[PDB]
Amino acid sequence: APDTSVSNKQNFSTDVIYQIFTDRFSDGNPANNPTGAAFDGTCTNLRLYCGGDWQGIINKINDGYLTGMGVTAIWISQPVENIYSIINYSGVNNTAYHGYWARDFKKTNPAYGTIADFQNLIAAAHAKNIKVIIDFAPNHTSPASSDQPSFAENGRLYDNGTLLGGYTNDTQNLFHHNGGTDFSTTENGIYKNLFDLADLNHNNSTVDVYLKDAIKMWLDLGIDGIRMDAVKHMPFGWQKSFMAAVNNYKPVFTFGEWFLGVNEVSPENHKFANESGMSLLDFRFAQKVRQVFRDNTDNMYGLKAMLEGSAADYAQVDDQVTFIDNHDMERFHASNANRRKLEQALAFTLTSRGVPAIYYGTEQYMSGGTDPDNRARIPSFSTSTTAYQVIQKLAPLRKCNPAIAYGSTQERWINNDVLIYERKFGSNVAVVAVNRNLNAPASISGLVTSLPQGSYNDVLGGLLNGNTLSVGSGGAASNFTLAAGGTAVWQYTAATATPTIGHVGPMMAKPGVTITIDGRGFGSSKGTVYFGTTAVSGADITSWEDTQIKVKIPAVAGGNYNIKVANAAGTASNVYDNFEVLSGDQVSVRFVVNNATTALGQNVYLTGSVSELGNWDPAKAIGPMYNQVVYQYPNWYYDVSVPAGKTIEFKFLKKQGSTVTWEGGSNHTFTAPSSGTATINVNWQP
Ligand SMILES: OC[C@H]1O[C@H](O[C@H]2[C@H](O)[C@@H](O)[C@@H](O[C@H]3[C@H](O)[C@@H](O)[C@@H](O[C@H]4[C@H](O)[C@@H](O)[C@@H](O[C@H]5[C@H](O)[C@@H](O)[C@@H](O)O[C@@H]5CO)O[C@@H]4CO)O[C@@H]3CO)O[C@@H]2CO)[C@H](O)[C@@H](O)[C@@H]1O
Ligand SMILES: OC[C@H]1O[C@H](O[C@H]2[C@H](O)[C@@H](O)[C@@H](O[C@H]3[C@H](O)[C@@H](O)[C@@H](O)O[C@@H]3CO)O[C@@H]2CO)[C@H](O)[C@@H](O)[C@@H]1O
Ligand SMILES: OC[C@H]1O[C@H](O[C@H]2[C@H](O)[C@@H](O)[C@@H](O)O[C@@H]2CO)[C@H](O)[C@@H](O)[C@@H]1O
Ligand SMILES: [Ca+2]
Ligand SMILES: [Ca+2]
Numbered sequence: 274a275p276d277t278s279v280s281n282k283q284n285f286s287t288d289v290i291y292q293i294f295t296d297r298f299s300d301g302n303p304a305n306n307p308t309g310a311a312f313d314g315t316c317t318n319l320r321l322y323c324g325g326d327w328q329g330i331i332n333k334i335n336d337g338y339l340t341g342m343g344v345t346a347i348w349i350s351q352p353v354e355n356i357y358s359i360i361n362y363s364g365v366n367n368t369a370y371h372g373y374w375a376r377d378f379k380k381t382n383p384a385y386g387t388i389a390d391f392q393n394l395i396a397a398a399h400a401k402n403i404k405v406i407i408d409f410a411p412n413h414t415s416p417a418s419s420d421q422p423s424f425a426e427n428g429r430l431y432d433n434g435t436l437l438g439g440y441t442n443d444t445q446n447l448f449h450h451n452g453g454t455d456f457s458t459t460e461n462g463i464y465k466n467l468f469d470l471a472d473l474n475h476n477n478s479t480v481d482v483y484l485k486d487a488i489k490m491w492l493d494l495g496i497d498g499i500r501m502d503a504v505k506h507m508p509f510g511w512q513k514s515f516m517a518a519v520n521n522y523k524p525v526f527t528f529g530e531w532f533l534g535v536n537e538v539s540p541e542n543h544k545f546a547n548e549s550g551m552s553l554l555d556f557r558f559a560q561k562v563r564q565v566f567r568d569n570t571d572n573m574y575g576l577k578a579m580l581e582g583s584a585a586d587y588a589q590v591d592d593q594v595t596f597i598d599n600h601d602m603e604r605f606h607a608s609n610a611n612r613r614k615l616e617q618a619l620a621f622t623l624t625s626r627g628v629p630a631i632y633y634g635t636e637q638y639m640s641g642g643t644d645p646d647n648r649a650r651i652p653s654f655s656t657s658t659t660a661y662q663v664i665q666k667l668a669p670l671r672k673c674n675p676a677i678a679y680g681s682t683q684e685r686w687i688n689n690d691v692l693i694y695e696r697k698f699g700s701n702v703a704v705v706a707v708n709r710n711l712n713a714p715a716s717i718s719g720l721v722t723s724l725p726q727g728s729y730n731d732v733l734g735g736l737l738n739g740n741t742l743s744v745g746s747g748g749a750a751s752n753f754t755l756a757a758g759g760t761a762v763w764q765y766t767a768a769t770a771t772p773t774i775g776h777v778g779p780m781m782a783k784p785g786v787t788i789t790i791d792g793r794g795f796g797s798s799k800g801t802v803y804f805g806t807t808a809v810s811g812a813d814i815t816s817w818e819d820t821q822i823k824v825k826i827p828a829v830a831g832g833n834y835n836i837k838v839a840n841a842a843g844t845a846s847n848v849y850d851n852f853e854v855l856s857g858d859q860v861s862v863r864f865v866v867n868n869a870t871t872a873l874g875q876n877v878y879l880t881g882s883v884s885e886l887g888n889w890d891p892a893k894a895i896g897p898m899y900n901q902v903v904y905q906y907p908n909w910y911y912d913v914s915v916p917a918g919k920t921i922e923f924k925f926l927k928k929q930g931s932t933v934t935w936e937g938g939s940n941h942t943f944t945a946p947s948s949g950t951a952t953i954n955v956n957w958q959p
Contacts, residue, residue, distance in 0.1 A: 276775070276791035276820040277672045279345070279402040282497045282525045283778035283789040286591050287678040288345040288404060289623070289668045290630040294600060295350040295385055296322055296370040297650045298633060299329025307384050311359050311368050319645035322370045327386040331397045338654045339403065342661060343668025346404035348500055348630065352391060352491070354380035356415045356426040371600075371648075372408070373502065374415035374470075376426060378487035379433035388494075395495045406526075407491060410502035411484050411515075413470035417441075419450065428471025432483060440471045449474055451902055454506075459541055462506050464902040475511040476863050476912065478949035485518045492523040501551060504529030509545060510861055510912030513781075516550030517859040517914065520782040527551040528594045528628070532601075535560050543586045547851065550781040552592035555627055557583060559596050566597075566618040566709060567605060573692045573709070577684050580694075584626070584682060588851040591679060591776060593627040600632065604647050608640040611711055613758040616663055616737060620760045623667040624696065624705045626682055636660040659736065666733055667762070674766055675793055676701035679775030685722055691715045691755060697723055699769035699793050704729075704742070708759040715759075720750035724765050732762035769793035772800070772838055772846035781853040784828040787815060790838065790849075795819050798841035804854070805834045831856030831884035831916070856883050856916035862951045863912050866898070866925050869957040870907045874929060877909045881923030882940075885915050891933045894926060918947040925957060 274280050277287045297316070306312060306324040316323035330349065333339055339347070354377040355369035372382055381388055398405050417428030417440035427439040430447060438447045449472035454465035466472045473480050488499075499519075504512060516527065529549070531542050533556035546553045561579040564571040584590050597618045598605040606615045615638065622629050634651050636658055641647040655661070671678050680698035687693065690710035696703040702723045708715055724744045731739030739761030743751040755761075775792035782788065790802070799817045802809040802824045809827050816823040822838065834852040839845045869877045876897035880887050887893030898909040915921060923941050927934040938958035945951070 274821065275818065279399060279404060281789065281791070281821075282404070284776050284791050285346060285404070285498065285526045285594075285628045286776055287671045288628065289343060289664070289671060290346045290348050290406065290594070290628060291339060291342070291344040291633065292348045292596075292599070292630050293330065293350070293633045294325070294648050295327070295330070295372065296325035297648055298325045299333055299651075300324035300326055301328030301330070301332045302326050302386070305384055305386065307368075310366060316650040318366075319648060320365065320367045320370070322368050322384055323650055325650070326384065327390045327394045331394055333654070334397050334401055334403065336654075338656070340401055341656055341665065342636065343665050344631075345402060345668070345672070346406060346497070347398065348406040348408065348498075350385070351375065351408040351410055351502075352381055352385060353378045354431075355382050358425050360416060360425050369415070373410055375410060376414060376429060377431040377433065378411075378484070379490060380431075391494060399495075404497035405495070406498035406500055407496050408500045408502060409488065409491075411473065412503045412506050413467060413472050415471060416469040417471040418469070419443075437479065437483070445477070445479065447474055447477055447480055448472055458901065459505075460899045460901050463508060467503060467506050475508060475861060476950055476952070481511070481861060481950050482948065485515065488515075488519060489522060492519070492525065496525060498526040499528075500554075501527060501529035504545070504549075504551070504553070505531045508861070508912035509549060510914050513548075513550055513914035514859040514861040516781060517783070517855060520550060520779040521786055521855075521858060524779040524782070524786070526778060528553055528592070530554050531556065533557055533560060535564065538582075546593070547588040548853075550779070550853070552589060552594065554630075555583075555593040555595045558593070558625075558627065559598070562597050562618055562621065563605070566614055566621070572689045573687050574689075576692060577687060580682050580684070589780065590626055592778075594630050595622055595625060595627040596630045596632065597622055598632050598635070598647075600648055601644065602647065603643060604639055604641045605635065606638050606640050611758075612638060612659065613711060613737070616660055617707060617709060617758070617760055619660060619663050620667060620733070620737065620762070621705070621707060623664065624670070624677055624703065624762060626680070626696070629671075631664065636664060662736060663733065666736065670703070670732065670762075670764070674701055674703055674764055675699060675775060676703045676764070676766075679792070686717060686720050688715065691717070693717070693720060695722055698775060699773045700767035701765065701769070703762070703764040705763075706739075706755055706759070706761045708755045708757060711758045714757045715755040716752070717750075717755050718752040722748045722750060724748055724763065729763040729765070732764060733760065737761070771844055772796070772840050774836070774838060774846050774849045777836060777849050777852065780851065781855065782826060783855040783857050784826045786826050787823055788826060790822040790824065790836070791820060792846070793820060794840070795822055795838065796840040796842070800838055800840045803837040803839070804829055804852070826854060829854055832888070833884075854884075856885060856919065858917045859885070859914045860917040860946050860948065860950065861912055862915050862945060862953060863910060864898075864923075865904060865908065865910045865952065865954040867908050867954065867956045869909050869925065869927070871927055872929070875927055878926050878928050879911065879913065879923060880926060881921050883916055883919065883921055885913070886921065886923060891926060891928070894928065897928070915945050917945055920944045
């Protein structure tokens with residue numbers, strides 16, 4: 274199939290995600306609605322179950338609501354079985370209507386449906402070329418109290434009906450008992466409870482194996498993607514090993530939730546997105562968008578900075594999932610605000626780089642503050658709104674104009690309130706003009722683009738006061754007036770002659786695994802794929818077409834490679850980098866070093882004989898290690914994803930800037946488990 278097919282579980286860049294809060298979407302089967310104090314069919318009590326289910330989704334899929342919008346993928350609430358208890362938080366009743374309070378990852382939430390229902394959902398969806406994404410929260414179970422076992426469900430963890438353990442009297446050590454996080458440090462938010470949620474201990478073999486087994490179940494059920502919840506609260510090392518378990522099995526586009534605040538930029542966040550094996554929800558983008566289009570706390574210059582910065586900070590910017598709001602923040606639209614604001618932010622998002630995600634109800638101008646006010650039942654399924662039409666008109670572009678899905682971003686005109694940017698990919702161009710100023714029009718002159726000479730009509734058809742663009746020689750646009758609150762979309766598509774790689778996924782895996790190379794101009798005849806200098810042709814290339822190539826990762830040494838392709842004619846393509854070839858299946862191992870004294874600003878790192886350990890290159894050392902929660906200075910610890918059943922050589926090092934101090938004596942050794950986890954405790958050697 275082509276890069277745009279619904280069958281492409283490795284690339285969402287051409288899709289549009291519709292984020293759905295199952296319980297608040299549609300109740301297609303009242304028979305499964307919870308009862309008693311846990312229910313509220315009127316949906317007036319936002320903390321109770323309203324009755325939204327999978328059947329409801331199916332109907333909305335079949336009735337044309339989603340399809341008519343141009344939506345090509347859905348992200349639904351965590352499908353697994355949640356606690357049943359009604360939690361009372363200071364007189365206020367609470368339910369697991371959100372599906373984040375897991376009790377059994379191997380079962381479904383009865384309120385949502387049965388495995389059969391789930392299966393129907395996938396079928397219905399696929400039948401309509403819609404990809405299905407599920408939310409997954411392996412960080413914790415549910416709210417608990419070690420002292421009050423009677424509270425809630427004690428965060429009990431069940432394995433397909435079989436009780437694994439609870440928060441109280443946790444002799445097996447399935448959970449963390451270090452209190453709750455204060456969000457002070459990263460380490461802090463990792464080995465501590467998220468609020469009152471029972472924090473799972475991934476260092477525990479039981480938990481580790483269980484979790485990996487569970488995801489496999491869902492994979493087998495045909496999901497197309499995964500939304501990892503609270504990745505900022507789980508050991509990065511473990512997560513990597515989790516991604517491998519996925520990628521080496523049945524790879525699917527995965528992106529985690531690393532919450533970022535206003536004006537907040539995190540290097541850790543960048544590093545994670547670039548080396549975890551999963552991408553992230555583009556909070557930086559979202560926050561900036563709100564500032565500029567919603568709260569007016571920043572201008573176009575800020576927007577531009579964000580675009581260029583992000584394009585440089587993220588190895589795979591096109592994999593980041595963009596948005597303007599979510600179930601965790603105030604709804605974009607304010608009951609009293611000018612709608613055009615929301616429409617504009619929409620257009621911008623839909624035409625920008627990354628994977629666009631729309632929170633259900635947006636197209637309906639839904640307003641609401643923080644949780645749960647931001648999760649009201651969708652008031653209506655009207656296709657008549659302006660927002661609905663914007664999406665309808667812009668969504669499809671991601672599928673027909675590669676510039677939008679894979680193109681680069683370049684500012685072509687800018688001022689306080691105006692922004693004209695260009696997306697480019699091969700022989701395809703897209704130009705977007707935006708005037709956030711709701712009262713003043715702008716005079717645009719000096720606009721230069723990559724568009725060929727000609728006349729371009731606004732893709733929005735004047736829906737947002739857009740206009741026709743006149744391009745002369747040298748891509749120079751004629752002088753024009755950009756209406757107040759104006760938004761226009763112009764584009765040019767054309768056949769691409771030379772092979773151009775637009776996307777790759779998965780980005781991390783072991784040899785043998787088939788990867789998907791998407792782009793244009795690959796030719797119809799099998800060419801050659803390059804993993805560094807290694808050539809791959811023939812059989813190993815399972816499928817080859819103009820827009821897509823499916824190839825098996827050659828058995829090369831574990832490491833980071835650059836991917837390149839050549840058409841049958843010998844023409845080489847651009848280079849896609851940052852490809853990680855694992856040394857094999859992975860396991861999560863905890864490294865502990867004792868008596869590693871250091872000075873302020875000086876941290877400890879880990880290095881060793883495998884690519885997963887940087888191969889002795891201090892510049893690729895693992896760390897800085899931790900020393901607050903689980904273990905305390907001068908003791909250091911860290912969870913690392915290493916090759917299973919491999920005899921590894923390692924040493925620790927002290928780093929201050931780029932200055933490194935090696936551990937003395939001879940290398941340490943150990944053989945990685947074949948499955949599950951392990952803990953390696955050693956003493957720092959002088
Ligand atoms: O977000 C987490 C945290 O991470 C990073 O901090 C880490 C440090 O980079 C790293 O050096 C390590 O810190 C150790 C330190 O190496 C060790 O020596 C010890 O530190 C002592 C000082 O030795 C001691 O003199 C005293 O410090 C004085 C300091 O002399 C004076 O100049 C002035 O700064 O006041 C200080 C008062 O504290 O106290 C400390 C504590 O005994 O212990 C440290 C660990 O406890 O590990 C850090 C992470 O744990 C970031 O750099 C940091 O901003 C982040 O908060
Ligand atoms: O590639 C050649 C070389 O690589 C490997 O050697 C590594 C060592 O095993 C490893 O300890 C580390 O060596 C550092 C010492 O531990 C430290 O005391 C100090 O001497 O710096 C050394 C690093 O420069 O790194 C090297 C690789 O750089 C392999 O084990 C060797 O057999 C092989 O000769
Ligand atoms: O003509 C090329 C020139 O166009 C853009 O500059 C705009 C500028 O952003 C506006 O604020 C205003 O000053 O008009 C200029 C064009 O005359 C690009 O921003 C700039 O890089 C480019 O050279
Ligand atoms: Ca129902
Ligand atoms: Ca945790």
